[PDB]
């Protein structure tokens, strides 16, 4: 699906091919950018606090729990996507791997069936 790996500060570490197609950023452009560039406000400005809250409390909220959210493409367009993150440790520091399943087609099919 699309895959993104970030470090404990929300910085993109790895960014898969399918992620590039989905979000519109190339791997080099994406890497080193904060994961919040992938979501609209008000979430964008808060994401760091979310990662910060968890880091500090050690109390999971959305770890291993998939939820539907609104993502943002490079061109400004937004779209619903299913997201699940796994926590992993490497080199002593924590990393988070997210799997994204695009849901636009589902949202359109559902909107359309409702309209008809
Ligand atoms: C691109 C669309 C995304 C949106 C809209 C989004 C939104 C959110 C929200 C609302 C929260 C906190 C929810 C709560 O308090 O229960 C959160 C937490 C978090 N997100 Fe995201 N996120 C996005 C993508 C990502 C990705 C791709 C990663 C991992 C590579 C990620 C990593 C995290 C982490 C580490 C937390 C903290 C977990 C916790 O507090 O339990 N997010 N996100």
Curated annotation (Swiss-Prot):
Organism: Bradyrhizobium diazoefficiens (strain JCM 10833 / BCRC 13528 / IAM 13628 / NBRC 14792 / USDA 110)
Record-level Gene Ontology MF annotations: ATP binding; histidine phosphotransfer kinase activity; metal ion binding; phosphorelay sensor kinase activity
Role of this protein: Putative oxygen sensor; modulates the activity of FixJ, a transcriptional activator of nitrogen fixation fixK gene. FixL probably acts as a kinase that phosphorylates FixJ.
Signal peptide segment: none
UniProt keyword annotation of Amino-acid biosynthesis present: no
Keywords in alphabetical order: ATP-binding, Heme, Iron, Kinase, Metal-binding, Nitrogen fixation, Nucleotide-binding, Phosphoprotein, Repeat, Transferase, Two-component regulatory system
GO cellular component: plasma membrane
Binding-site residues, heme: 47
Originating gene: fixL
One GO term (biological process): nitrogen fixation
Identification of the protein by name: Sensor protein FixL
Residues annotated as domain PAC: 56-115
Keyword match Nucleotide-binding: yes
Residue ranges of every copy of the PAS domain listed in the record: 1-55
């Amino acid at each position: 699906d699309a895959m993104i790996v970030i470090d404990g500060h929300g910085i993109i570490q790895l960014f898969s091919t399918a992620a590039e197609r989905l979000f519109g950023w190339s791997e080099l452009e994406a890497i080193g950018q904060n994961v919040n560039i992938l979501m609209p406000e008000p979430d964008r400005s808060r994401h760091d606090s979310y990662i910060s809250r968890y880091r500090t409390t050690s109390d999971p909220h959305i770890i291993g729990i998939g939820r539907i959210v609104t993502g943002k493409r490079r061109d400004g367009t937004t779209f619903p996507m299913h997201l699940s993150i796994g926590e992993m440790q490497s080199g002593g520091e924590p990393y988070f791997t997210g799997f994204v399943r695009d849901l636009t087609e589902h949202q359109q099919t559902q909107a359309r069936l409702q309209e008809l």
